[PDB]
Design a protein around this ligand. Sequence first.
Ligand SMILES: [Zn+2]
Length: 44
Amino acid sequence: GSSGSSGEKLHECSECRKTFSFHSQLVIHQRIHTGENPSGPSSG
Ligand SMILES: [Zn+2]
């Protein structure tokens, strides 16, 4: 596959794999994922 044209390897998420204009934003996005901690011994 002949790559048309490339430049600066943009950044993207690791959970949703979404690209962002600037990494700065990306890092902020990854947050949405990291939320409350439900996983636990709590059976009820
Ligand atoms: Zn994400």
